[PDB]
Short mmCIF file of C-alpha atoms and ligand atoms in Angstrom, two decimals:
data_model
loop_
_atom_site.label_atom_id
_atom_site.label_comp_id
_atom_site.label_asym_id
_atom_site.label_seq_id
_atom_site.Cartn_x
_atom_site.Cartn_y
_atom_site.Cartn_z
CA UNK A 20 -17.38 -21.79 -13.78
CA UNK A 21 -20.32 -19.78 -15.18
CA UNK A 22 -22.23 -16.95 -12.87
CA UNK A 23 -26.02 -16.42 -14.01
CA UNK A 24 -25.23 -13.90 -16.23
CA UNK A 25 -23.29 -16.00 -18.46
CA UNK A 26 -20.18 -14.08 -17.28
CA UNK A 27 -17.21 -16.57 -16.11
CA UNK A 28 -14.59 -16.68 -13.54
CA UNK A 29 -12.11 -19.77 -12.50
CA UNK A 30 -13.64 -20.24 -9.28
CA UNK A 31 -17.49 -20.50 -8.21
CA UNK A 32 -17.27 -18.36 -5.32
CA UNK A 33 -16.28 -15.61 -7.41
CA UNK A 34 -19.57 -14.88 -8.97
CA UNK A 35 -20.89 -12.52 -5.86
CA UNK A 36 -18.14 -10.20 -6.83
CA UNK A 37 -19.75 -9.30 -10.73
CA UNK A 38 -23.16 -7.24 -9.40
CA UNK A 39 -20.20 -5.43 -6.44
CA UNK A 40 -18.15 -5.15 -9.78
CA UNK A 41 -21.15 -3.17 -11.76
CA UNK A 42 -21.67 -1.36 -8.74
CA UNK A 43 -18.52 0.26 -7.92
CA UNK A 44 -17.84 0.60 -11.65
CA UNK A 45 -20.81 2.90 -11.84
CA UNK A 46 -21.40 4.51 -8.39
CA UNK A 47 -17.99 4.85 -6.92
CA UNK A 48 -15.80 5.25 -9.69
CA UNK A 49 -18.39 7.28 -11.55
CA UNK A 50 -18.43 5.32 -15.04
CA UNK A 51 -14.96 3.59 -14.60
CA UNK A 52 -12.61 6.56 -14.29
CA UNK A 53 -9.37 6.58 -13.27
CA UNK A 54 -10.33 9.88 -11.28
CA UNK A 55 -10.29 10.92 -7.64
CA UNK A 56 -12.14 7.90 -6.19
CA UNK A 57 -9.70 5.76 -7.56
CA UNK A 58 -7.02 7.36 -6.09
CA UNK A 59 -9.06 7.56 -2.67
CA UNK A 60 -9.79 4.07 -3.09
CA UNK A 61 -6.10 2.92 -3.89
CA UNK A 62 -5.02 5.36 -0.50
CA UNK A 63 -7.68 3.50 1.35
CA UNK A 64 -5.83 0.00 0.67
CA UNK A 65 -2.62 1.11 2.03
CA UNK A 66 -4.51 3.02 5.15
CA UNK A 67 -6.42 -0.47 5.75
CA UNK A 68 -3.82 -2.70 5.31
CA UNK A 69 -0.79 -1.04 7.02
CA UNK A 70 -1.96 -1.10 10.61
CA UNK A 71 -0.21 -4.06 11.23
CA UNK A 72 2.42 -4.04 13.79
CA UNK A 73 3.83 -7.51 15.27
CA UNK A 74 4.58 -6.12 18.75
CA UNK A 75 1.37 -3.86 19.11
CA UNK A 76 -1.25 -5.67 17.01
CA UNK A 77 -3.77 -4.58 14.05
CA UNK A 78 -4.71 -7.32 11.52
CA UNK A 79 -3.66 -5.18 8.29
CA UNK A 80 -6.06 -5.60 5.66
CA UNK A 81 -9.08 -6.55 7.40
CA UNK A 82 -11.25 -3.43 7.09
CA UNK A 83 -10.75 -2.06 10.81
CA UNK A 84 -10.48 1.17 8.92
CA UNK A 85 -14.30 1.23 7.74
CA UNK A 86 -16.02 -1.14 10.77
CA UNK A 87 -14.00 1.10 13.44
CA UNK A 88 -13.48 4.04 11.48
CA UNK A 89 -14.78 6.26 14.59
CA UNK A 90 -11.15 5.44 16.01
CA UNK A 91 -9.25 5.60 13.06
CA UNK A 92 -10.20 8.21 11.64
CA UNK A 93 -9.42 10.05 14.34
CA UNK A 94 -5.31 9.33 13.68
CA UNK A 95 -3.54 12.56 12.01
CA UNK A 96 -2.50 10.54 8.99
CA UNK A 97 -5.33 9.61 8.11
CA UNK A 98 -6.62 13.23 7.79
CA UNK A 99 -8.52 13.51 4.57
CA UNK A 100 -9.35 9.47 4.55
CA UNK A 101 -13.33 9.90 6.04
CA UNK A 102 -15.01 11.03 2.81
CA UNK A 103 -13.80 7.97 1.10
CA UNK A 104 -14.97 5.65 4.00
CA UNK A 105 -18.45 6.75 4.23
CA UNK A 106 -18.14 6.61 0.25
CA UNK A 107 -17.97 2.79 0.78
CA UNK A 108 -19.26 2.00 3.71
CA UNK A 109 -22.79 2.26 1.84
CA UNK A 110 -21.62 -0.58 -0.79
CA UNK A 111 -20.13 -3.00 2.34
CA UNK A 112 -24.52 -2.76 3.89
CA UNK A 113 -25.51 -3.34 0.81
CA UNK A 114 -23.42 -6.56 -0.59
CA UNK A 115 -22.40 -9.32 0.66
CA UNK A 116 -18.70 -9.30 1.50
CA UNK A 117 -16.54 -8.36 4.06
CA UNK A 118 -15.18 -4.73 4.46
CA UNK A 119 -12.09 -6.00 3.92
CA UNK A 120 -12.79 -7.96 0.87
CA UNK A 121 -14.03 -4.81 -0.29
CA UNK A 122 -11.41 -2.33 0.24
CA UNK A 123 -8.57 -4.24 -1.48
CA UNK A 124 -11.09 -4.94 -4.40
CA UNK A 125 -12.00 -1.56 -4.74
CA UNK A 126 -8.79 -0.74 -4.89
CA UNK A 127 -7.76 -3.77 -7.37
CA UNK A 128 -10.95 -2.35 -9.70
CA UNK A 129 -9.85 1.25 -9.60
CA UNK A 130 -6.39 0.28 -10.77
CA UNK A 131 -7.57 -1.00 -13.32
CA UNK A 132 -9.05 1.91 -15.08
CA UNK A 133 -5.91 3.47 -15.41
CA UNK A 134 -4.00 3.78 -18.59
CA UNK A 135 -0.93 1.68 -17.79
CA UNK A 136 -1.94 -0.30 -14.56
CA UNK A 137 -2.60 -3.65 -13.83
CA UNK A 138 -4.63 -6.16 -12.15
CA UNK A 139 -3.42 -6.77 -8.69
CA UNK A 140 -4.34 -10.48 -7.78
CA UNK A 141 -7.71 -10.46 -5.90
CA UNK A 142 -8.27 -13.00 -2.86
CA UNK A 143 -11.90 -13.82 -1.11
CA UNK A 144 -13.02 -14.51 2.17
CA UNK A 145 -11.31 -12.20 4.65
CA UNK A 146 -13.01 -12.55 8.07
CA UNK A 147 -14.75 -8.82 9.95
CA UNK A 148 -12.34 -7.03 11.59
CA UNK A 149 -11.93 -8.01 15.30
CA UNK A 150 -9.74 -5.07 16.56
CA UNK A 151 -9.02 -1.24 15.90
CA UNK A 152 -5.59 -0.72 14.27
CA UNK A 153 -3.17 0.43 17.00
CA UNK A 154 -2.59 4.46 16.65
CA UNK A 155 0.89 5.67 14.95
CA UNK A 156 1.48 2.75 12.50
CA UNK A 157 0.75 4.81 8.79
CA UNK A 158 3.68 6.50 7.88
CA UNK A 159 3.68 10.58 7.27
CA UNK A 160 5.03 12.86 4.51
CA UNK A 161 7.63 14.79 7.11
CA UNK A 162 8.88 11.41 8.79
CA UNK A 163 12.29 10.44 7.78
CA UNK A 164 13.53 7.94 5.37
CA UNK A 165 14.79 5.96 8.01
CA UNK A 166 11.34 6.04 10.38
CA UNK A 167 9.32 5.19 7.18
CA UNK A 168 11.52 2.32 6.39
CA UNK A 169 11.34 1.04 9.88
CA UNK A 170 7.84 1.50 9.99
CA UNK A 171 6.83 -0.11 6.44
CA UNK A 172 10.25 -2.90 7.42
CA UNK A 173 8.14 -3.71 11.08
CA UNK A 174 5.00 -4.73 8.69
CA UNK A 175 7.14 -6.45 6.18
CA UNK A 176 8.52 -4.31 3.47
CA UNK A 177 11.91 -3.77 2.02
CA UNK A 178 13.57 -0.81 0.80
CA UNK A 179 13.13 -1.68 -2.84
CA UNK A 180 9.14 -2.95 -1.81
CA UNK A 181 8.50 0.66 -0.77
CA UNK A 182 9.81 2.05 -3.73
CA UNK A 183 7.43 -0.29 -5.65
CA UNK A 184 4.48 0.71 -3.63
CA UNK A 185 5.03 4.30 -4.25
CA UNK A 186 4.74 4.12 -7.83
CA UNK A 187 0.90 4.49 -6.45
CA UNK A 188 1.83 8.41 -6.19
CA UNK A 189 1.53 8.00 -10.37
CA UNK A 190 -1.96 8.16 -9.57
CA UNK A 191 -2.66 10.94 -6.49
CA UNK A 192 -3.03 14.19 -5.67
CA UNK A 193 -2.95 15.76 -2.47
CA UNK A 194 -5.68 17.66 -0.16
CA UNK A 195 -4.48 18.47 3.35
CA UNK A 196 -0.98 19.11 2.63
CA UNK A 197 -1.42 22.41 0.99
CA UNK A 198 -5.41 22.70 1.68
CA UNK A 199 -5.06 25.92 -0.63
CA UNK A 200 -4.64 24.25 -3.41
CA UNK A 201 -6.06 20.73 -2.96
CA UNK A 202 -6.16 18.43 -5.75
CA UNK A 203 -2.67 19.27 -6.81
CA UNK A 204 -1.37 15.71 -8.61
CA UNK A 205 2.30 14.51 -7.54
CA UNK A 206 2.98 13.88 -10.96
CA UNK A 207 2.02 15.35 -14.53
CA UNK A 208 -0.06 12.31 -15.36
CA UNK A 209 -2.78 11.59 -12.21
CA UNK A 210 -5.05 9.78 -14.45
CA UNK A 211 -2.21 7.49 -15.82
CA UNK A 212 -0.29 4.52 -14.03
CA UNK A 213 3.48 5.74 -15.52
CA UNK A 214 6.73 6.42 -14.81
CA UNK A 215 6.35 10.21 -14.58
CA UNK A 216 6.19 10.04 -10.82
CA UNK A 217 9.83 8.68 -10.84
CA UNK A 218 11.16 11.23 -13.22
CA UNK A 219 9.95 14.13 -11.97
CA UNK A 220 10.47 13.67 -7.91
CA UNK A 221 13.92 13.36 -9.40
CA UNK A 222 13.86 16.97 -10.93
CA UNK A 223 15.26 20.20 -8.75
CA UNK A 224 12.79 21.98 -6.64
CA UNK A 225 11.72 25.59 -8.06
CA UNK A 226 8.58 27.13 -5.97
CA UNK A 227 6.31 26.09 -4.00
CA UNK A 228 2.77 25.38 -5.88
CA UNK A 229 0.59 27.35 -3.41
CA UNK A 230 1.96 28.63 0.35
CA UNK A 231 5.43 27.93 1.90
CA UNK A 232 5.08 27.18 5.14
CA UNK A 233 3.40 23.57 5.31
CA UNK A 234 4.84 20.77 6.95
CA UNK A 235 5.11 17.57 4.97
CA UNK A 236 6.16 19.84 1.39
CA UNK A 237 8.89 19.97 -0.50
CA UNK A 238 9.43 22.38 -3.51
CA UNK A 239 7.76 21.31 -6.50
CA UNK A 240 9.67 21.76 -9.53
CA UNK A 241 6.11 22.21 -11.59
CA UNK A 242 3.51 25.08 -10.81
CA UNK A 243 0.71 22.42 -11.14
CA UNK A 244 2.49 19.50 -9.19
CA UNK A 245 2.90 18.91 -5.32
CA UNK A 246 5.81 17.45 -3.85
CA UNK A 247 5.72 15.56 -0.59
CA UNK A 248 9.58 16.03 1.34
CA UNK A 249 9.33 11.78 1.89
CA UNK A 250 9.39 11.64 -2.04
CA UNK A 251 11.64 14.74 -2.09
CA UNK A 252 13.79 12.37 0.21
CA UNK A 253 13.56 8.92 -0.45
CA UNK A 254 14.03 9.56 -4.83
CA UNK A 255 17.88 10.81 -3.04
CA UNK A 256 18.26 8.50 -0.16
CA UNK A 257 21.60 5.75 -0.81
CA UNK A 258 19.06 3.61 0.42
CA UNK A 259 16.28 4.09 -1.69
CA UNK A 260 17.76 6.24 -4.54
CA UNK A 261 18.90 3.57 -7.24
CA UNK A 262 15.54 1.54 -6.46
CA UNK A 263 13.71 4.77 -7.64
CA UNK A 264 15.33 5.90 -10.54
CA UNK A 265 15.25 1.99 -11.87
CA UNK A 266 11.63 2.63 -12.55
CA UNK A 267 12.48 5.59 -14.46
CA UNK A 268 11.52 4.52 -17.99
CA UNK A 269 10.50 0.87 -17.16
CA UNK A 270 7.15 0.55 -16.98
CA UNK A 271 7.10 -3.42 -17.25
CA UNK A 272 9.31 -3.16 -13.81
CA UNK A 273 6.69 -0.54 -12.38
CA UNK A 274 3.91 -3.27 -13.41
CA UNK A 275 5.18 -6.60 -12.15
CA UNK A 276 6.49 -4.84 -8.80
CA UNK A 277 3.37 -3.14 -7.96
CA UNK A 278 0.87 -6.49 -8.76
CA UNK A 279 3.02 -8.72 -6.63
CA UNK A 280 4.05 -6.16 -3.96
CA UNK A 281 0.30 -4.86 -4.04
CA UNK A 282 -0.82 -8.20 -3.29
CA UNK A 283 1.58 -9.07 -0.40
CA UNK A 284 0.24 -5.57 1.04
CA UNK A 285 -3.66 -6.61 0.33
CA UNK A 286 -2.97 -9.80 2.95
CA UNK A 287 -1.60 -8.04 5.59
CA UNK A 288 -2.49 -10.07 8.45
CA UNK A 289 -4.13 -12.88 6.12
CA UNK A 290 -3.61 -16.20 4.74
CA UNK A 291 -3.76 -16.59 0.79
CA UNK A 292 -4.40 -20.29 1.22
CA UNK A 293 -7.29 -20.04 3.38
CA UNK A 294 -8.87 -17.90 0.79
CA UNK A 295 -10.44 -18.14 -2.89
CA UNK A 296 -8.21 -16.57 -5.68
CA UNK A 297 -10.79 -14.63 -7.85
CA UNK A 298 -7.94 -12.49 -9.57
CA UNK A 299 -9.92 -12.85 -12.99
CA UNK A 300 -12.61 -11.20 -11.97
CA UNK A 301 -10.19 -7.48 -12.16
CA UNK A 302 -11.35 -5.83 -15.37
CA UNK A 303 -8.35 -5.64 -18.07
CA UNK A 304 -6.29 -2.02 -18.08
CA UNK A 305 -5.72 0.12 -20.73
CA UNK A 306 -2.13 -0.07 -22.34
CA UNK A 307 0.65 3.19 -22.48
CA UNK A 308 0.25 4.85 -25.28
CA UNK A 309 3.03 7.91 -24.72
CA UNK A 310 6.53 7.68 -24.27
CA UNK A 311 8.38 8.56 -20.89
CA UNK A 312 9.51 12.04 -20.63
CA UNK A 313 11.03 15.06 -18.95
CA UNK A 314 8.72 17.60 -19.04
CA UNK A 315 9.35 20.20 -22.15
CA UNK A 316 12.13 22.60 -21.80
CA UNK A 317 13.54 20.71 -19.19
CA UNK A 318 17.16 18.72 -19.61
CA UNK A 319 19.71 16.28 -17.68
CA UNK A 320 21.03 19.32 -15.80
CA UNK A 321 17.60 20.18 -13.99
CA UNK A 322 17.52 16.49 -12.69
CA UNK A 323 19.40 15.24 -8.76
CA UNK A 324 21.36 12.23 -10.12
CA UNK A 325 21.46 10.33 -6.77
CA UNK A 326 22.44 6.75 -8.00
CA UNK A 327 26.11 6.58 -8.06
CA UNK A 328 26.50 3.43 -9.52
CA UNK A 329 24.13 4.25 -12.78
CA UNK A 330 23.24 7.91 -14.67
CA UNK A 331 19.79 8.82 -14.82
CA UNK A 332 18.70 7.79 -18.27
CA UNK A 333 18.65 10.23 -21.00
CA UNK A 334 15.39 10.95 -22.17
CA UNK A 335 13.21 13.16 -24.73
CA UNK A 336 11.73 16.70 -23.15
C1 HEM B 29 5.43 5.07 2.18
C2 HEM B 29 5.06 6.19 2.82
C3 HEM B 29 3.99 7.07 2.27
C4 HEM B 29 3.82 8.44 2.63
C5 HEM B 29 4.60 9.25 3.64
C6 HEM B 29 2.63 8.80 1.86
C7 HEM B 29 2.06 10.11 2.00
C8 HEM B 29 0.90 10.54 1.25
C9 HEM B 29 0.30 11.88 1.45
C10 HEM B 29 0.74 12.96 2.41
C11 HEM B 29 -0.81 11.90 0.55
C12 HEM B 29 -1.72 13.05 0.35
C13 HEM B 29 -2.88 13.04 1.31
C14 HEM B 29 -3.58 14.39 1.26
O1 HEM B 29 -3.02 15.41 1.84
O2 HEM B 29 -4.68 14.42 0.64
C15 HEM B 29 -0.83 10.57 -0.12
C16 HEM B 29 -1.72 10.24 -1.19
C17 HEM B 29 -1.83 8.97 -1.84
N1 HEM B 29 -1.20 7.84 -1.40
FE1 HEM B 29 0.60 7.87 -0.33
N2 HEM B 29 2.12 7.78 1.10
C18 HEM B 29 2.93 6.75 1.32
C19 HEM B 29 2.77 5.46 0.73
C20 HEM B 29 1.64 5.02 -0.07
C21 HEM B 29 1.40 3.62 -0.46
C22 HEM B 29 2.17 2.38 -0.10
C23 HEM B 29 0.25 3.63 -1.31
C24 HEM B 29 -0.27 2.40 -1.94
C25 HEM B 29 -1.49 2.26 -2.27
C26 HEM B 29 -0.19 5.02 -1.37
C27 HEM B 29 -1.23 5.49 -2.20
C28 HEM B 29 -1.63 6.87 -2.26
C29 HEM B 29 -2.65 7.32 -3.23
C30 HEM B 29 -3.36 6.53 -4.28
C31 HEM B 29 -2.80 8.75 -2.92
C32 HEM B 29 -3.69 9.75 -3.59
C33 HEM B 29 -4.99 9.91 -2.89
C34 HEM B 29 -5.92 10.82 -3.66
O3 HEM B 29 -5.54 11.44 -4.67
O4 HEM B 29 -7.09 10.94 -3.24
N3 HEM B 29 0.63 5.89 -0.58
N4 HEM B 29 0.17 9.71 0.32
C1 JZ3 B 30 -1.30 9.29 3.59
O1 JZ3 B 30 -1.95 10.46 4.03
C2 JZ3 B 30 -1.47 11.31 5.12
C3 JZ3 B 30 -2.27 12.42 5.51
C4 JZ3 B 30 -1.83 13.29 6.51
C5 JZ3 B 30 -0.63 13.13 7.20
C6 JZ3 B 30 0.16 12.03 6.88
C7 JZ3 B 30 -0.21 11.12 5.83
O2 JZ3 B 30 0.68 10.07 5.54
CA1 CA B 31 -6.71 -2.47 9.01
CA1 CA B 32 1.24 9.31 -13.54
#
């Protein structure tokens, strides 16, 4: 089909999302950057989407975080997730799609101006939120490997499918962990969709980037980088460890994982068929242009191999 501005998509019903498109482009994301309201936006997905619990309700991504934000809000983990939601709030008045619709394509738009990412497939037509996610379903930096596996397995997720989803923290920074220093990035690259994340959760903790004391924090091994102690513990966990330092270095893995796992986690308590694929509509990423890498002066000996069945691989510094 062709919209009215000549612009085309597969599907017909696709042409609303080109003005909400523009929009965003220029008033969320402030001119397409992969900044901090892409990473807000991208937080916002999993936030939305992951109160979904079979035995206590929620309908995952369905926008319950935005129509009954007053509630959800309110939850401890999602401390820090109000300035976003009033951020888009504004754009759900305004167009004409459902605040779930908008969330994951927000989030699916975002992506996509950063340097290595991809376009996770984009479906239309979610209904309005009917309930308020049940309290206690989003997982927290100081819960255990074990509870956050449990937690993400109870809405769907494998082991490996978490590890996928977390190559996310390629992109993010953290404000209420450490609210000294907010804004600190969990990897060297925030503004690029890359391995680093992988590598350097992998390295030794050295110091802490601003105070001690805060639950939730690991050592960093970077002045300049945060470490949450779920990274700290699931890059080192036999369940999770091998999983993570596979991505290491394989950014086509990292790409294809986080699309299709992305996608399963944008229809959280939907149904694909009853809905119009307008995946096309995504803008197109820009490519990798630098090579994986330990950061300079560091070596082999400064990373926690914790995959006994394969060495971490050797790369430049
Ligand atoms: C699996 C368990 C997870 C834990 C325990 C976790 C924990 C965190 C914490 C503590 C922050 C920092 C919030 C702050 O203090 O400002 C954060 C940021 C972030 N999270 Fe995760 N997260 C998890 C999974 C995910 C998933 C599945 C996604 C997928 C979209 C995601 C995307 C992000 C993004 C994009 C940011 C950066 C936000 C920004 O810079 O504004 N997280 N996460
Ligand atoms: C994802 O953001 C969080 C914020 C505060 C506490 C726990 C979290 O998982
Ligand atoms: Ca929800
Ligand atoms: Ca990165």
């Amino acid at each position: 089909a062709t919209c009215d501005d000549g612009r085309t998509t597969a599907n017909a019903a696709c042409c609303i999302l080109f003005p909400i498109l523009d929009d965003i482009q220029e008033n969320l994301f402030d001119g397409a950057q992969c900044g901090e309201e892409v990473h807000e936006s991208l937080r916002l997905t999993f936030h939305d989407a992951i109160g979904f619990s079979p035995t206590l309700g929620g309908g995952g991504a369905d926008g319950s975080i935005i129509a009954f934000d007053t509630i959800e809000t309110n939850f401890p983990a999602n401390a820090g997730i109000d300035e976003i939601v009033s951020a888009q709030k504004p754009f759900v008045a305004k167009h004409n799609i459902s605040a779930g619709d908008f969330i994951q394509f927000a989030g699916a738009v975002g992506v996509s101006n950063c340097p290595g990412g991809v376009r996770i497939p984009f479906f239309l037509g979610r209904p309005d939120a009917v309930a308020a996610s049940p309290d206690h379903l989003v997982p927290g930096p100081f819960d255990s490997v074990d509870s956050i596996l449990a937690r993400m397995g109870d809405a769907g997720f494998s082991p490996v499918e978490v590890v996928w989803l977390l190559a996310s923290h390629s992109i993010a920074a953290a404000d209420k962990v450490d609210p000294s220093i907010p804004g600190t990035p969990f990897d060297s690259t925030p503004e690029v969709f890359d391995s680093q994340f992988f590598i350097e959760t992998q390295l030794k903790g050295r110091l802490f980037p601003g105070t001690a004391d805060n639950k939730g924090e690991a050592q960093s091994p970077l002045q300049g980088e945060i470490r949450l102690q779920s990274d700290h513990l699931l890059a080192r966990d036999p369940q999770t460890a091998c999983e993570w330092q596979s991505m290491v270095n394989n950014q086509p893995k990292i790409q294809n994982r986080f699309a299709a796992t992305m996608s399963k986690m944008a229809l959280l308590g939907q149904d694909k068929t009853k809905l119009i694929d307008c995946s096309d509509v995504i803008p197109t990423p820009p490519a990798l242009v630098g090579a994986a890498h330990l950061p300079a002066g560091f070596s082999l000996s400064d990373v926690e191999q914790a995959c006994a069945a394969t060495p971490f691989p050797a790369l430049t510094a």
